[PDB]
């Protein structure tokens, strides 16, 4: 049970900090007037898409 708790907390923390990293990836490029996803810098390297 302790091993299972350790692995589940590790995976949960990893997923949470992946989410934080995803936010930090392009929260500035969600901003700025006009513009689009860089594409040439990242297309799906950090899942930076929401429809169009």
């Amino acid at each position: 049970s302790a091993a299972c708790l350790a692995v589940v907390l590790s995976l949960l923390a990893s997923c949470y900090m992946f989410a934080t990293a995803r936010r930090k990836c392009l929260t500035p490029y969600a901003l700025t007037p006009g513009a689009v996803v860089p594409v040439t810098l990242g297309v799906l390297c950090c899942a930076p898409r929401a429809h169009a």
């Binding site: 929260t27 500035p28 490029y29 901003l31 700025t32 007037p33 006009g34 513009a35």
Partner: protein
């Protein structure tokens, strides 16, 4: 025709936000989106803007959210130029020098954030937050971009309105 364009484009763009009759921040309309200072709380006056979900920023204290297609007639040009001149916001002109935005003392007051700054060609430049007093002139704090990657510029001791 010099600042008549300014007051004409000021209408239908700035929106009112007040907790209880206390105007705190104003919302702009450019870039197919809406910006506002996230450090100050409130509620938008327009019912349509209230229901739509909105993002949030930690240290950049800005915000971006998608606008629907029934207000496509209130968008500015949003192209970046960096000369050393004037940009004449809603109260007074604007003095710029050494990469710094500067205002005459007494031309602004606390609780007046949210006023956008746009070049005299009718083209939005940045959004004003506030500043601090050093002598006969007061500094500013705005956000500037080069086609992307908005960046802040806050001199030491600055204080947002």
């Amino acid at each position: 025709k010099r600042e008549r364009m300014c007051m004409k484009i000021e209408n239908d763009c700035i929106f009112e936000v007040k907790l209880d009759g206390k105007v705190t921040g104003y919302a702009c309309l450019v870039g197919d989106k809406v910006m506002k200072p996230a450090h100050v709380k409130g509620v938008i006056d327009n019912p349509d803007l209230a229901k739509l979900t909105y993002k949030k920023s930690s240290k950049y204290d800005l915000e971006c959210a998608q606008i629907p297609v029934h207000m496509k007639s209130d968008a500015s040009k949003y192209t970046h130029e960096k000369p050393e001149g004037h940009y004449n916001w809603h109260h007074g002109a604007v003095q710029y020098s050494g990469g710094r935005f500067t205002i005459p003392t007494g031309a602004g007051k606390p609780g007046d954030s949210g006023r956008p700054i746009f070049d005299n060609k009718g083209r939005v430049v940045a959004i004003v937050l506030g500043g601090a007093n050093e002598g006969a002139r007061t500094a500013l704090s705005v956000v500037t971009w080069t086609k992307d990657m908005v960046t802040r510029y806050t001199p030491e001791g600055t204080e947002e309105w």
